[PDB]
Design a protein around this ligand. Sequence first.
Ligand SMILES: CCCCCCCCCCCC[N+](C)(C)[O-]
Length: 421
Amino acid sequence: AGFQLNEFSSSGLGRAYSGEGAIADDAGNVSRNPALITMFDRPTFSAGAVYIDPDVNISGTSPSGRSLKADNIAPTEWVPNMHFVAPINDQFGWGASITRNYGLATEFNDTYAGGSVGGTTDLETMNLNLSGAYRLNNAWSFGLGFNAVYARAKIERFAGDLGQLVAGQIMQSPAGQTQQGQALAATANGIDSNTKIAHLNGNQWGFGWNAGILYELDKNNRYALTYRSEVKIDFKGNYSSDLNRAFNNYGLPIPTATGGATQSGYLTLNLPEMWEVSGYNRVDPQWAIHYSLAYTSWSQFQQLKATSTSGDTLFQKHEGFKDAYRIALGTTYYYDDNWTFRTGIAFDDSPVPAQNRSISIPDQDRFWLSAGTTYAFNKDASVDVGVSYMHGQSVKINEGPYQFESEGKAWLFGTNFNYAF
Ligand SMILES: CCCCCCCCCCCC[N+](C)(C)[O-]
């Protein structure tokens, strides 16, 4: 789902995040729907983390004859999560949490033949949420939240085999027999594959709000609607390219060369708004069913465009994403006072139109299968453990002068410790 993340808690991870927003067995869920606060009778704490181990691979052959094979370009991630919920009174409550709604990590060896569109891509996001909720009656509750998002990002691209390709072309041309052409070819050949073609890094804060509506027929059946506003991060960081400035202003498809000099850069990153409808049904003292449909407006992510203090475009990449949906269904089986078991299935559509696919964001439609279990220590303290398997469809990628093919899957493991005072 682009670079969107749903791992806000270990439980739920075991649910395949189905019906989040309509379930409140532990404090984690307030982060997804502030209205659920009215479901807590006392200060409740939750904290843990999810290890995401992706297995994304790239295959292909370049016009240079070199392999575009790149195994495991998606590094494993560690997504912590922490929550606290507290009643103000039988009418209002509040909560605070630290989670990750967005993130991405793609890494190619700097000598990768397709380095110009490979290299390194890292996006780290942290969401600090503060919420409040109001219960109107036995059925309706309302929640509103404020969010402060800290983001650390870094982008690096390399020459790859472009120098070789350029040299080849010059040499196959009438210019190949000329002094100017030869000097040109020498230079092109001289551009090593690990030559840093572009560098972009920065950290910045963004702000957004969210809200939720909870409606419960009774104490065992509820539905929810939530909205997470878009969050715009206005980066002000550093840009550079180790290429010689003599490369500039010819119209070449290459980021602005700065002779290695660092230049101040601006880039706005749009973090997509999200909508979600949820349902939780406890059809028995030991069985509950949960499901949801989420809609993330990825069309809000149109491009990555870095700009200089003069307003010149130093680096630009069209993304052209489209809105996407996510569907999830799961059930929880409360065996006894100590044990609770859960499973889930989910499907999230990729927001990237085929012609806009890039190897930097190896996304694709995903199917999730998961299982988890929770051990209750004493009606006040518990531990959650969940696992999920992600399987994605292999797709073709045409980027620049290259044709790639990618496949990706993933294993997720998480644990969270819960405590209610
Ligand atoms: C000061 C500029 C800082 C730029 C770092 C921006 C990172 C944006 C992360 C989104 C994913 C990047 N990608 C793959 C689309 O290029």
